Amino acid sequence: MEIKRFGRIREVIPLPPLTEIQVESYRRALQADVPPEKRENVGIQAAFRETFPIEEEDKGKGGLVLDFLEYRLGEPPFPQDECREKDLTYQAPLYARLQLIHKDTGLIKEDEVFLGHIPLMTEDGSFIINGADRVIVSQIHRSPGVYFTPDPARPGRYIASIIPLPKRGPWIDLEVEPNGVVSMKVNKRKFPLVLLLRVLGYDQETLARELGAYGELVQGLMDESVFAMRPEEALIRLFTLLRPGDPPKRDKAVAYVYGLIADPRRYDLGEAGRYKAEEKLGIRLSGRTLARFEDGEFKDEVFLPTLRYLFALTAGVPGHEVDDIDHLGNRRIRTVGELMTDQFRVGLARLARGVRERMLMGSEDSLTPAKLVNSRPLEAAIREFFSRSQLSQFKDETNPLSSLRHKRRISALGPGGLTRERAGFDVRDVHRTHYGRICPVETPEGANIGLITSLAAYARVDELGFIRTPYRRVVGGVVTDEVVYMTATEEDRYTIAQANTPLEGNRIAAERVVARRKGEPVIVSPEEVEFMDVSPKQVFSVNTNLIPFLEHDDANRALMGSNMQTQAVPLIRAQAPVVMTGLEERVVRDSLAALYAEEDGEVAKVDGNRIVVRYEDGRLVEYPLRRFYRSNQGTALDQRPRVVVGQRVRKGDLLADGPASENGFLALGQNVLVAIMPFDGYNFEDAIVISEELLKRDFYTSIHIERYEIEARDTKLGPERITRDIPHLSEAALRDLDEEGVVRIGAEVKPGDILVGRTSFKGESEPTPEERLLRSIFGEKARDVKDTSLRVPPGEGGIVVRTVRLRRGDPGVELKPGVREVVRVYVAQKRKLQVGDKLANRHGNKGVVAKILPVEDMPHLPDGTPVDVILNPLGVPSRMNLGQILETHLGLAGYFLGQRYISPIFDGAKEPEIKELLAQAFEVYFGKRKGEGFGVDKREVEVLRRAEKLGLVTPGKTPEEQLKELFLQGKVVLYDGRTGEPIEGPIVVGQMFIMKLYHMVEDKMHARSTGPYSLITQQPLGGKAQFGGQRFGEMEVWALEAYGAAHTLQEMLTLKSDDIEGRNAAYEAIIKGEDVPEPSVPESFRVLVKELQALALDVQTLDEKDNPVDIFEGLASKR
């Protein structure tokens, strides 16, 4: 087979390493691979430094100084696989050097204290917290700066806002209401903007004249002169304004807090906050945030500029000072590292909290080790973040691509500080700056839309979480191959042009060529084009970049297409699309599906379980292949070797293919020939008809594994024994229970077979008088033990492929309390395509199989080749994705031309080029037909007649010539198959890639007869093996209400869910073929009345004549 790729826009730079966000974040987070000597000191080392110098001076005796030297973590407790076999949390051990000083001669240095076991990252980017691989999703919020937003209700003038994160740390606002007041608010209640400047040292004259001479608003500043005539007294007076009833005297204590250390922030001195400054407003910062404690007299290079800009912003054009919040230079992305470093420092504080208490508890000087450090906080802290954080989740590895996405996705919801559930519509929309920074398609359909979203192609978090997008420079009418990763803010100052602009190399080619200033489409000239877009791909996400002709498909349904892939299940037979975009390779490669060759060499052994290659360097390494592994969602992950024995390998070539790769290419689902017409009703709204022939060949077939587990609990009644002994009825059910107790590997287990046996005790505390007689009658000596054995839950099971048993003398495992022993059973099963299943192309056509037809009668082509799947046309107009119809056409050519192609995102294949390949195909299709010996059918000519009366073929040309025309159009004649007659009018057909979608646990059709019931509420509940009832909601009640369905509704409210006495007599009644009984009072009612009685109120039902009647049958009358 050969590959021909259509579009030409010189792809100047390769796509970046896809999991860079996740990997580098945790890299800078924990700078452990490099010595404490190395300069990157953010994250762990930073959070450490931040809370390590614990100064505790006086209240009794102090002068405490605990100091940090170097952080070092290095020997992992256990290894990855062992952490998954055994329930383990893969975490690296960390103990840094600590030395506590004294006011008396001596400084004891107690070297190490291992507190906090912190998880590590897999080379792919995912974690291993407990058994299941987990992922930390990125987040979004208001970057810690200062902005000016229009006032709430009064149309008048806008107010200033100073945003300082951590939460603890003031939040200021400047608002002027001129009849006599100005408002500056920290926690809440306002005070003068000048009383503060005065404190710092700014006097009425110097302030007013230099800052607001051009700003008449200065007059509100010099207004309350009585107070402005006393400097340092203004410090005490403001202290007074705050309100507790505090000591007037506190030299420079509170001023410190809004000064140097805590509340303002330790975010890197230089670019963290000072970026938002110099460009937006004010020029300098002396000390990270407004900070100083050298002379007692504070310096504030930030407090005046904010007002300065307020007087500026309100008076004209110093610049145009209006901040669009949603500008990405305002919204920052929290990479993994930050998310962990934060919980790491929260823990450090918790640690430092308790240590302070022990600086007073330890008797004399030997207090370095145990007296100061206790590992309880850091453990619970960090542990809580990797196992309980809302942000870290189950790795979604239905198929590699999926997991990869789930690793890079960015969420809103989180810490609570950033953006909760309330504010949405302004955030949820795709802001202008989302260009190359975030896909506009990739987000989730559903209430949680736009909030959660994976990033774009070239998108990269630079120094601080600002998705910069690449844009190449174009000096004059010359375009460069140089690129600038620009901040959201800066992007607006320039005139940017799109990549579609006719390019000769460095020369732009058309006078009137498009560009877009700031979120505004603008036809600019080649001489104004300052910067140009990097690529069509950078605009969207990876997950989206994989769609063939995205260009022709409505963004709305292309979403479906991008989310559909995430739901692709690995088929044992994986095929790449007949038409691909260009990233399938990079996807599998950057994801860690296939196994690539490190350096060049030859192959030694090619097992089904290992490929030991021999590099030319004189070395050889054994490469194990995850034979059959259980993915979190139960999809097979097998690495099938593609290299033969003794083969010279190129550096970086596929040795084995991943779960879903054909040949180093991403492959989900399979390319299938498809006719696109209506069948009876089998494809009516969105139903798919499939040719049995697709099952004959193991085409849509996937392997699944579920992991049934049971424990031997310790009851005070007697241990639950796990033995082959199943107390009451047969050995036939014991067969596969070969091993005493456990089931035999490779055994076919159907629903209702014992996967594992176990025996608990019969009653709660006492035996049974009635059951005493029965046992005695046929065999008194009866094992009183109960059959509590793990069984095959309704639904299905396959063949047991692996089992695990953890008994008494535990190796290095964590058995929970009460838990005597555990028994895991991995079962696998082959899933052949069936009518309940749902398949869907990458464009969005989603649908379920409604009928598997016999190859016998489905639409067949002139040469006996039949179609596999028949898609309904009606699903194409409403939705707007012609891309699928464009795929099928190129596919048709690929079929007869025996070749696959690569049609890039927007630069790809063009309508004439395709017609050109179809032209080539007609000769393979019909050329052979000529030579093979025959011409045209009565049928073939017949459809032609109707085709010309239609207008598809130029009247008067020869059928041979006409069919070519008709073929070029992408459609060919098809015969019925059932009748053998033709289908009046040419129908299109061709190679369309189609994937099969994963079946959720819900998919397991739940049917429930009778079963459990909740303890407090008496309504049907399921769980393990009894399915649990369906909800009958209000919207449904009314549906019945509307109908004269009186009884049917009572039933739903009595006999079916709550009537305790009702349901019982109900069943029984049915059992004897008696018409169900007439409902007794529902427990809902009774529970109510009593709840109501629980409160003073008395609810008594009444009779015809206002007299009692009784709901509580006989249990309320007394004694």
Curated annotation (Swiss-Prot):
A GO term for molecular function: DNA-directed RNA polymerase activity
Pfam families: RNA_pol_Rpb2_1, RNA_pol_Rpb2_2, RNA_pol_Rpb2_3, RNA_pol_Rpb2_45, RNA_pol_Rpb2_6, RNA_pol_Rpb2_7
Domain of life: Bacteria
InterPro entries: DNA-dir_RNA_pol_bsu_ext_1_sf, DNA-dir_RNA_pol_bsu_external_1, DNA-dir_RNA_pol_su2, DNA-dir_RNAP_su2_dom, DNA-dir_RNAP_su2_hyb_sf, RNA_pol_bsu_bac, RNA_pol_bsu_CS, RNA_pol_bsu_protrusion
Coiled coil regions, renumbered to chain: none
GO cellular component: DNA-directed RNA polymerase complex
SUPFAM superfamilies, alphabetized: beta and beta-prime subunits of DNA dependent RNA-polymerase (SSF64484)
Bilayer-crossing regions: none
UniProt keyword annotation of Glycosyltransferase present: no
Keyword set includes Metal-binding: no
Annotated keywords: DNA-directed RNA polymerase, Nucleotidyltransferase, Transcription, Transferase
Any single GO BP term: DNA-templated transcription
Catalytic activity: RNA(n) + a ribonucleoside 5'-triphosphate = RNA(n+1) + diphosphate
E.C. number(s) listed in UniProt: 2.7.7.6
CDD domains in UniProt: RNA_pol_B_RPB2 (cd00653)
Similarity-based family: Belongs to the RNA polymerase beta chain family.
Free-text function comment from the UniProt entry: DNA-dependent RNA polymerase catalyzes the transcription of DNA into RNA using the four ribonucleoside triphosphates as substrates.
Known partners and oligomeric status: The RNAP catalytic core consists of 2 alpha, 1 beta, 1 beta' and 1 omega subunit. When a sigma factor is associated with the core the holoenzyme is formed, which can initiate transcription.
Xref: HAMAP family: RNApol_bact_RpoB (MF_01321)
Name this protein carries in UniProt: DNA-directed RNA polymerase subunit beta
Native species: Thermus thermophilus (strain ATCC 27634 / DSM 579 / HB8)
Organism lineage: Bacteria, Thermotogati, Deinococcota, Deinococci, Thermales
Gene: rpoB
